[PDB]
Amino acid sequence: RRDWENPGVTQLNRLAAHPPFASWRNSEEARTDRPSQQLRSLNGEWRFAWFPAPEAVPESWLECDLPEADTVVVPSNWQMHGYDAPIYTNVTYPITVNPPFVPTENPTGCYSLTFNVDESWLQEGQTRIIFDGVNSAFHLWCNGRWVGYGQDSRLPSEFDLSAFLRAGENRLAVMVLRWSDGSYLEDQDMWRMSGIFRDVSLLHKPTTQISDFHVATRFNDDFSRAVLEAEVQMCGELRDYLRVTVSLWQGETQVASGTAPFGGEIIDERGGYADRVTLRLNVENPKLWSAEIPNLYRAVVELHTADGTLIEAEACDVGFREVRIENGLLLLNGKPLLIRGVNRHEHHPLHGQVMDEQTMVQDILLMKQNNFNAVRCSHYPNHPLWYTLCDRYGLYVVDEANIETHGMVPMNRLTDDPRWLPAMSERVTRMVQRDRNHPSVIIWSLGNESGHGANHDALYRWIKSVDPSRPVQYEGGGADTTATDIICPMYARVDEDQPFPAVPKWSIKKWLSLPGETRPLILCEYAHAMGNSLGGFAKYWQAFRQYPRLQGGFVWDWVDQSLIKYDENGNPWSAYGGDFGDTPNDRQFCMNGLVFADRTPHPALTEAKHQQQFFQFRLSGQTIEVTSEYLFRHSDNELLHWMVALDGKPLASGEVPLDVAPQGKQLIELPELPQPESAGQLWLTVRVVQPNATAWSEAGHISAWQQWRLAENLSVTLPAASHAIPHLTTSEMDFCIELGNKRWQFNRQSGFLSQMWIGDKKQLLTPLRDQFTRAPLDNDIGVDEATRIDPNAWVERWKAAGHYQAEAALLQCTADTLADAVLITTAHAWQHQGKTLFISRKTYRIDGSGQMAITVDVEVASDTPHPARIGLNCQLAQVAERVNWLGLGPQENYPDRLTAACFDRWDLPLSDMYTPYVFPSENGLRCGTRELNYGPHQWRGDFQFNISRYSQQQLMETSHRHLLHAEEGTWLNIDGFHMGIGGDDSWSPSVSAEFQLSAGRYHYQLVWCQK
């Protein structure tokens, strides 16, 4: 019947959706959340054979294992075992757009398992199989007989096997299709994979059973009284002796309990639900759930006879919290939230889209350690364990339906079509039925990038009707449609409007106050963290803090979707789109994470942590004012450490207990600090330290920091009068300068310093030259292709203007002998096709102390695109182990992403001065640097620098980090000025005006000496 090419058939013989069941037959096991004998895992070694189409599958496979089959681990994606290629495409569907049809060549995965069933399971009750995740559609047979069919890759499909099984050995056969009509609703920007990629389980339920239960918590005005309402539904043999008991536990203490027979209130002319009961439990002074303090109770639902026979028990964690929107604000337990969120795909570099507990916990720990309090399930319901972990560790969750039709033209072509309403309804309704009891879920989402269709409006109303406890949001069709309670745009900028036709992205500040608008605004996606990014992140956070109705957002996104491949030597490397022969593909656009695929942080993670801090600081004279942004908790695991240093030299430090109420303030007066006689800038650094370990952090965890300049004493002392005078030697081709053990050589044809000697050892492999370009960042490139040129992207503007190919023409090169120095004066013009782009005028003053003072003045043509940098570069002959600097660090920082960096004396291995972005670009810059030390060299001034074994040219020319080779010596880039990195999005120019090098004239000065 080709059910996989029919959106009218999304399942056959599939059981109703419900909250997580375990069918405990002992109430104490249910209370403690211990394993249930009635819930078995079928994970492990299965048999697998790959076919190019379902028509290629032999009939014998239904009755008998195929000899050519392999033994593989389940859950798995079959692409991860090498059976066919994973495909990375963003918007464009991986199949021809011809709904509801899929390709005749439809990769088919034939899974089978021989497994044991105990006689006891078949003597009574009901045995069901549960497939938590099958991508994208499947038929199931048991012992050769057809059972049913399922679609929706991201929710459990359950089938009754009671009539199919025999005692002892049984065989399942599962035919999994890569493509189905469901694929039209699964166009998320991610790797396209397939298989049985979540858990498989066997569940025994009694004939008379709990078939559904809902838990709600309502509160009085000040949250001092609550009512827990539990609606319980049964299936099977309905009798007067039946009862439900709901008991509520706080650890080992029972706080509340209620018992009732079945038979709900009358609801209409035909009566009520005889198979339902609602229990209402009064709870005095409930401990409330938040991401700050994830207080949980345990609810045990016992189905039993009145006279005391437990039939079965189910249970869940209960978090007492109210979510409501009032007067334009999203409130949790009466207080306005500030969402420090991130979007998180389910991705593992080795296992693909298979999730494990260890990876989930690792992610949650890192998120909380970096001041995140919220996660969006981009863009599908997650593995069931995710919600349990968010309940327990404390993260707010946006649970999102598995509906994305991005590649349709227009985007709402399916979502406005009533014929696709059934398929869409199932993806929304079965999510809600599964996840509605989790306190961590605070907002429902209708899916992602599917335009706005009448189906969205219908399903919005459905959710509002069945679950009034949670707002519903949806970004499609302009972010503020009738299908959303929250204005939830993606990549709307802070101040700048983007007035696209039909779906404009207004400035978020402006959006709030459009005529008639009252809703809160929380960005579903913002700060696109692709490669060297998160420029302008601080601008979002300032706006969030200033505007009550700007309640935060979810960063895009958590983890790079890179996959591991192996070279000829068997060494692993990170692969992206196209690396598996997948075509068409979207190359590196799958890597947008704050962390690498192996969960190593990108530098941008520290900027997020800092801007998302829960304590705010102000300094007034000697007094530090600390303000708490916590809504519910006191600062009961926090001390403030302070330190004052003079140009990195510690002068005084202390620690003070933090005792701040939520939303409260504490004033801390610093002790009397002695005025230092020595020249330099005094800097105050404060850090909030957590003395005690928590569920999510180690003792000594730093949660917040801030820095201020204190008193500065400008140096007025003159350097000691030099004994010697440098000697100049002139030839037609060179100016040569000598002083003691030092020599400098300036080439008179090029006008550059071409060599230096310390003692007898040469210092340069390439001359010291101006540099006005950078190896383009992902944000500089956007959607620019070799086959599809985007002329608006920064890289294309620079290329078209000739920035990368401009040749220095020498205008002036002179030498003068002074009383105590030699002065070299140069001027160069950079030209492309008769156009002068830049002029650089320099002096080099070499004095009797051996120091070389370099003054640089640059003119930039007003009509050329603003340059990426204004600086110098050279390749140093030496490779040293360490890099030591006085300036911002320790991590990579750029002009629009340097708030997290602190001014101090930093010392790192050379390798740490390179950031291994999978797609290579300009990287490793440190800004605000006053002194740099490397080998025998010292540079002083006020500059930005990077230092590495890789030239800008190599970074520019290499597509993958594993293909980079260390060059001879060390490439040094020292910039007077560097352009912002941007990142509001990564497909259009996003560098704000104040971070563009538009001044026309630029001045910087450096001293180069030997330390």
- Known binding site: residues? 90, 189, 404, 406, 449, 525-528, 585, 589, 592, 987
CB of residue 640 vs Na ion: minimum separation in angstroms? 9
From the list 416, 449, 796, 847, which residue makes contact with Mg ion (rule: CB under 5 A)? 449
Find the binding residues for a copy of itself in span 241-270 (CB under 8 A): 265-270
Whether residue 157 contacts residue 131, with contact meaning beta carbons closer than 8 Å, is answered with yes
Q: Which of 302, 449, 638, 796 is catalytic?
A: 449
Tokens for 612, please give them: 């998302």
Annotated binding site for Na(+): 189, 589, 592
Contact between 6 and Mg ion per CB under 5 A: yes
Please tell me the chain's helix, strand, coil percentages from 3-state DSSP, rounded to the nearest 5: 15, 40, 45
Distance CA 31, CA 19 (A): 16
Q: Is 525 annotated as catalytic?
A: yes
Closer Cβ to Mg ion, 181 or 475, answer by number: 181
Phi, psi of 886, rounded to the nearest 5 degrees: -105, 110
Q: Give the residue ranges of the annotated binding site for substrate.
A: 90, 189, 449, 525-528, 592, 987
Ranges within 367-426 binding Na ion (CB under 5 A): none
Q: How far is CA 902 from the centre of its chain?
A: 24
Residue 810 has a CB neighbour count (10 Å cut-off) of 15
Q: How many CA atoms lie within 13 A of 400 on its CB side?
A: 27
Phi and psi at 383, nearest 5°, equal -45, 135
Residues from 4 through 63 that contact a copy of itself (CB under 8 A): 6, 8-12, 16
The runs of H, that is alpha helices, within 819-971 are 952-957
From the list Mg ion, a copy of itself, Na ion, none, which binds 823 (C-beta under 5 to 8 Å, kind-based)? none
Residues in contact with a copy of itself, shown as a per-residue x/- string from 404 to 443 under the rule CB under 8 A? --xxxxxxxx----xx-xx--xx--xx--x----------
Q: How far is the CB of 8 from Mg ion (least distance, A)?
A: 7
542 interacts with, out of Na ion, Mg ion, a copy of itself, none, CB within 5 to 8 A per kind: none
User: Whole-angstrom Cα distance, residue 495 to residue 551?
Assistant: 16
Q: What is the DSSP letter of 894?
A: B
Pick the closer one to Na ion by CB: 657 or 759. Answer: 657
Contacted by 123, from a copy of itself, Mg ion, Na ion, none: CB < 5 to 8 Å by type: Mg ion
Q: Closest Cα partner for 289 from 337, 322, 253, 313?
A: 322
Using alpha carbons, select from 155, 248, 244 the residue that is nearest to residue 208.
244
Q: Which does 199 bind (CB under 5 to 8 A by kind): Mg ion, a copy of itself, Na ion, none?
A: none
Which of 77, 93, 184 has the alpha carbon at shortest distance from 135?
Answer: 77
Among 136, 592, 612, 893, binds Na ion (CB under 5 A): 592
Residue 520 in tokens: 């809160």
DSSP lists the bridge partners of residue 654 as 642
Which tokens go with 187? 């166009």
Sign of the Cα torsion 794, 795, 800, 803 reads positive
* Least distance CB 479 / a copy of itself (angstroms): 11
Q: Tell me which of 80, 375, 463, 658 binds Na ion, using CB under 5 A.
A: 658
| Strands (E) located in 306-415 | 310-318, 323-326, 329-332, 335-336, 339-343, 374-376, 396-400
Does 305 contact a copy of itself by CB under 8 A? Answer: no
Q: In the complex with Na ion, which residue's Cβ is closer, 83 or 580?
A: 580
Determine, following the binding rule CB under 8 A, whether residue 160 of this chain makes contact with a copy of itself: no
Which one of 352, 477, 553, 850 is in contact with a copy of itself (CB under 8 A)? 477
Which residues, including other chains, have CB under 8 Å from residue 516's CB and lie 6 or more apart? none
Least distance from C-beta 616 to Na ion, angstroms? 13
Question: Of 184 and 903, which has the nearer Cβ to a copy of itself?
Answer: 184
Q: Does 920 bind Na ion (CB under 5 A)?
A: yes
CA 61 to chain CA mean position, Å: 43
Specify the DSSP element, H or E, that contains 792.
Answer: none
Residues 269-298 that bind a copy of itself (CB under 8 A): 269-274
Q: 297-305 and 242-250: which strand pairing?
A: antiparallel
**Closest separation in Å from C-beta 102 to Na ion:** 24
Pair 576, 919: CB distance under 8 Å: yes
Q: According to the binding rule CB under 8 A, does residue 451 interact with a copy of itself?
A: yes
Distances in whole angstroms, Cα of residue 869 to Cα of each of 157, 784, 798, 803, 886? 56, 21, 12, 11, 21
- Residues between 488 and 547 that touch a copy of itself (CB under 8 A): 500-503
Q: What is the dihedral of CA 113, 117, 121, 125, to 10 degrees?
A: 20
User: Interface with Na ion includes 922 (CB under 5 A)?
Assistant: no
Least distance between Na ion and beta carbon 661 (Å): 11
Rounded Cα distance, 57 and 176, in Å: 11
Tell whether residue 482 is a contact of a copy of itself (CB under 8 A): yes
To the query of whether residue 449 is one of the catalytic residues in this protein, the response is yes
**Alpha carbon distance 703, 687 (integer Å):** 8
Is the backbone peptide bond immediately before 345 cis, with ω within 30 degrees of 0? no
Enumerate residues 537-566 that contact Na ion by CB under 5 A. Answer: 544, 550
Which residue in the set 340, 376, 406, 828 belongs to the binding site for Mg ion (CB under 5 A)? 406
146 lines the binding site for a copy of itself (CB under 8 A): no
Does the protein bind Mg ion through residue 9 (CB under 5 A)? yes
Question: Which does residue 920 touch among Mg ion, Na ion, a copy of itself, none (CB within 5 to 8 A, set by kind)?
Answer: Na ion
Kindly write out the interface string for residues 357-396 of this chain, putting x where it contacts Mg ion by CB under 5 A and - elsewhere: ----------------------------------------
Q: Tell me which stretch binds Na ion (CB under 5 A): 164-172, 188-196, 680-688, 762-770.
A: 188-196
310 CB contacts (<8 Å, ≥6 apart)? 25, 26, 27, 302, 303, 304
By CB under 5 A, which span of 217-225, 275-283, 405-413, 920-928 interacts with Na ion?
920-928
DSSP letter (8 states) at residue 33: T
Three-class DSSP category at 110: strand
783 contributes a contact to a copy of itself by CB under 8 A: no
Shortest distance, CB of residue 86 to a copy of itself, whole angstroms? 25
Q: Which is nearer to a copy of itself, 422 or 691 (CB)?
A: 422
Binding of a copy of itself by 163 (CB under 8 A): no
Contacts of 465 (CB under 8 A, 6+ apart): none
Determine phi and psi for 363, rounding to 5 degrees: -65, -45
Cα 261 from Cα 273, distance rounded (Å): 12
Q: Which is nearer to a copy of itself, 270 or 723 (CB)?
A: 270
Identify the active-site residue in 525, 607, 892, 922.
525
Residues in contact with Mg ion by CB under 5 A are 3, 6, 9, 123, 181, 189, 406, 449
Catalytic residues: 449, 525
Given the rule CB under 8 A, which residues bind a copy of itself? 1, 6, 8-12, 16, 265-274, 406-413, 418-419, 421-422, 425-426, 429-430, 433, 449, 451-452, 454-455, 457-462, 464-466, 476-478, 482, 500-503
Residues that bind Na ion (CB under 5 A): 189, 544, 550, 589, 592, 635, 638, 657-658, 920
